[PDB]
Amino acid sequence: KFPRVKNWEVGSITYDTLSAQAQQDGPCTPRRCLGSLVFPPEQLLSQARDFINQYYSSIKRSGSQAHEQRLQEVEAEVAATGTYQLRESELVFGAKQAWRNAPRCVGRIQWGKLQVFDARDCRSAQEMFTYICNHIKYATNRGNLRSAITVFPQRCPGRGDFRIWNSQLVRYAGYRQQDGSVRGDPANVEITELCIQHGWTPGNGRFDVLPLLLQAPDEPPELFLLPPELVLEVPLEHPTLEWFAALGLRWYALPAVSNMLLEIGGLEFPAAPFSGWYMSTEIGTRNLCDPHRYNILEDVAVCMDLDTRTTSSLWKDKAAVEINVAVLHSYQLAKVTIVDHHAATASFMKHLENEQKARGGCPADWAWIVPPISGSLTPVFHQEMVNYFLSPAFRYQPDPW
Amino acid sequence: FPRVKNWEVGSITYDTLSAQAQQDGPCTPRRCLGSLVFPAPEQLLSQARDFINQYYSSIKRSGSQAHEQRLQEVEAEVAATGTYQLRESELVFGAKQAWRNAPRCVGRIQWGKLQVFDARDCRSAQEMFTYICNHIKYATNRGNLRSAITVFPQRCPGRGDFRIWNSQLVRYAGYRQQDGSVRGDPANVEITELCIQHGWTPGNGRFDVLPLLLQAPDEPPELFLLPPELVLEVPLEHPTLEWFAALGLRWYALPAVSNMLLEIGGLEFPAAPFSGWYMSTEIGTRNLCDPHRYNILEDVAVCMDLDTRTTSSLWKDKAAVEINVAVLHSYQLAKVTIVDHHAATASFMKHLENEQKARGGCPADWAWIVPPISGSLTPVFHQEMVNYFLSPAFRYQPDPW
Ligand code: HEM
Ligand code: HEM
Ligand SMILES: CNCc1cc(F)c(F)c(-c2cc(C)cc(N)n2)c1
Ligand SMILES: CNCc1cc(F)c(F)c(-c2cc(C)cc(N)n2)c1
Ligand SMILES: C[C@H](O)[C@H](O)[C@H]1CNc2nc(N)[nH]c(=O)c2N1
Ligand SMILES: C[C@H](O)[C@H](O)[C@H]1CNc2nc(N)[nH]c(=O)c2N1
Ligand SMILES: [Cl-]
Ligand SMILES: [Cl-]
Ligand SMILES: [Gd+3]
Ligand SMILES: [Gd+3]
Ligand SMILES: [Gd+3]
Ligand SMILES: [Zn+2]
């Protein structure tokens, strides 16, 4: 009933007792495991009781005056309005907990250092844009990156949602050709097609920053050109491969997910963009070397004069490491915050032991915590993990179309 | 039926075979335990009945006279003895199916090409030794490795099991040290001690081949030295790092797993060693670079004059790539079969396509199929998989001591 979990590098055994609390059931059964799949009126009071109970136990305040009192006020708000409002401190507490509960996030050692911008008093896309622009400039901070989330108004029935239509606040364009293939990032062909559709003049480039499609309740979206001085980018160069600069590769400083739904206490915020800083394999391995992404691996190998005629030269492996070195070197030279996959996973091990002591476990998704290069060279590879869903949470949600 | 996506190509399939998963696994809708390493005549009848059905399907005779006659035969044999005997052809098919069904094997494109030695008439630990030497001789084949399995007598009532105490036929001793360290392979410290206390005179190298501890029913295990000329090994050298040879590193040619149980139609064979050939990462990454194994990573990196002072130099990634290059070059120089992780995962994608057409799916453990370096550079990273248990099957079993 309490999973026994082992670390094979050291031999140590822990029990995940926190797992016994898991709520929104996952996709696995005793008959088949689906852990490797990416995407697997008044029950509101149940989720509310539990979250407010969480909040007060966290501040050493269970069964106290402010606790029972706040419980009645949510009872009364829902009774009269069919919903409720979070106290500002609860909204701050819920955002940090959801980050803390994200099983696929390797950077949760940072979960208590998060800046929350309360945008629950927002109306119209033009207003979101200034909220978003303030987030970006605050989080970017001339390259000394700072974790932030901007929380736009919660969801109510009979009224449409606030939504950011881009998956991230900074994405590069993907344009097709006289032959189907894509100039730019193929991960964003859809939203590039939607932006151009809504009256944006495309570029001719591999690294064109897309505009933003912001949508206010029960209204169509609006394009917004991001201020170019607010979008910090890093040209990629290699410390010793002089020709790497000539490949013309770049990436942006701020990873800011703008398509996930934040759920606290039974309330749902479909517009809540959050940002941290990059782990270097995200850029150098997934974004630039994935076959369906920029797919540069062979081009770098030719420049390195590697033998691409046989897979057993490990030319792929060699080129991939140099691309990752170039990312780290370039961000450091730009003085933009970035973390390598060894340093991050080592910190995640530290986080796991923190969370064992504090909460008796930590939901973690082994396939997402283990980096996409050098997996067994990092300590998380040899750590057995337990994956489950706790609330507050970040959840995926359908594209708003 | 679980919908399964490949993210490199965008294609989608449904794993209908999963609906037939017999014995149950460790996951629930509450929590996923996929990353854990170790997750009555009437019941024997119904397993037996299912396997026979499988066998007669495969030979295009489902529903025949011989089919029903064999069912009847199996029932009368269970009624009168509490067990039954496999026919030889049924045993060959059961052993191939067990390999086919093994979710953590990336080499299963080869599943139909397997040599089955029927040792079920084996009488003692001395005969068992002779059968094993013959297996090693045939499978090694002077470096042109051939996949094989030798099946010793089945678990049956009134008698104990045949057991091979060694986890593989070829293993290097691990000697706990003066200062509490280990000389040789730390994975084999337990079995090394057992050999010594059963009369083996230890060596004190890092690559001392262990004797075999072979157990006949209701007999203490018996010690057997492998004839040196039967154990093919490969000294490790690097194609361009000439000091690499001075590490004195070696590995053996034949990976022959000997401590697993083969189950076929409810019959259990606690001794049925099987062998194929190596994928280079097993040796170059896990066996040599795991911190709890040979753990050579930092010594190579220093020798390469990498900057081992900061993780952002990626010295670990670079040293590990050259260790894998050395393993591949060395085996190819010695003319000993080996497959690199790029070719292996590519042939596994073809296996998944073959199996999707043949059975409607394929049991696959993503965390074990994706190689421990350069994960997302291989195509199995971008393929979603369903993990489940089919019979016939190789199972883990407790060590007999
Ligand atoms: C501060 C440094 C941070 C680092 C280094 C980091 C790293 C990562 C990485 C590598 C992933 C895997 C994503 C992928 O490969 O697609 C991830 C996922 C995730 N991160 Fe973090 N992150 C950071 C900050 C944050 C913050 C501030 C939040 C929320 C406030 C957050 C929430 C999440 C969530 C919810 C996921 C799961 C997304 C999904 O399921 O697709 N992260 N993170
Ligand atoms: C011929 C080439 C073969 C290759 C390249 C290959 C490759 C692999 C690899 C890389 C693993 C993962 C091992 C680990 O990381 O611990 C594995 C596991 C496994 N293989 Fe294969 N293999 C081959 C032949 C065979 C044969 C002939 C059999 C049985 C007749 C077999 C049955 C299994 C089983 C049962 C496992 C899982 C072992 C466990 O769960 O601990 N393999 N294989
Ligand atoms: C190739 N990764 C793309 C990707 C997908 C996601 F779903 C993420 F959540 C993040 C992400 C988010 C944050 C806040 C920090 C960070 N380092 N990454 C990145
Ligand atoms: C670091 N791997 C150790 C290991 C553990 C296992 F459980 C295996 F089954 C194999 C294995 C077995 C066969 C027949 C071929 C092959 N290439 N590997 C290897
Ligand atoms: C098919 C597989 O589940 C899918 O590609 C997952 C695996 N693990 C991952 N891990 C991270 N961090 N990011 C990803 O996109 C993926 N992709
Ligand atoms: C704890 C973790 O599950 C463990 O180290 C697993 C991960 N994936 C693996 N994959 C393979 N092929 N072999 C292994 O031994 C492991 N070990
Ligand atoms: Cl990204
Ligand atoms: Cl091995
Ligand atoms: Gd030149
Ligand atoms: Gd030289
Ligand atoms: Gd020395
Ligand atoms: Zn699972």
mmCIF file of C-alpha atoms in Angstrom, chain A residues 50-62 67 93:
data_model
loop_
_atom_site.group_PDB
_atom_site.id
_atom_site.type_symbol
_atom_site.label_atom_id
_atom_site.label_comp_id
_atom_site.label_asym_id
_atom_site.label_seq_id
_atom_site.Cartn_x
_atom_site.Cartn_y
_atom_site.Cartn_z
ATOM 1 C CA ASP A 50 -8.986 20.225 0.897
ATOM 2 C CA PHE A 51 -6.949 23.131 -0.497
ATOM 3 C CA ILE A 52 -7.804 25.534 2.343
ATOM 4 C CA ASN A 53 -6.944 22.723 4.772
ATOM 5 C CA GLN A 54 -3.617 22.334 2.951
ATOM 6 C CA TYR A 55 -2.891 26.058 3.139
ATOM 7 C CA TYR A 56 -3.418 26.362 6.880
ATOM 8 C CA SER A 57 -1.475 23.235 7.808
ATOM 9 C CA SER A 58 1.422 24.648 5.753
ATOM 10 C CA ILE A 59 1.440 27.825 7.886
ATOM 11 C CA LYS A 60 1.136 25.806 11.141
ATOM 12 C CA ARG A 61 -2.488 26.874 11.514
ATOM 13 C CA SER A 62 -4.744 23.800 11.420
ATOM 14 C CA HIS A 67 -8.913 28.414 9.586
ATOM 15 C CA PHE A 93 0.440 29.316 -2.057
#
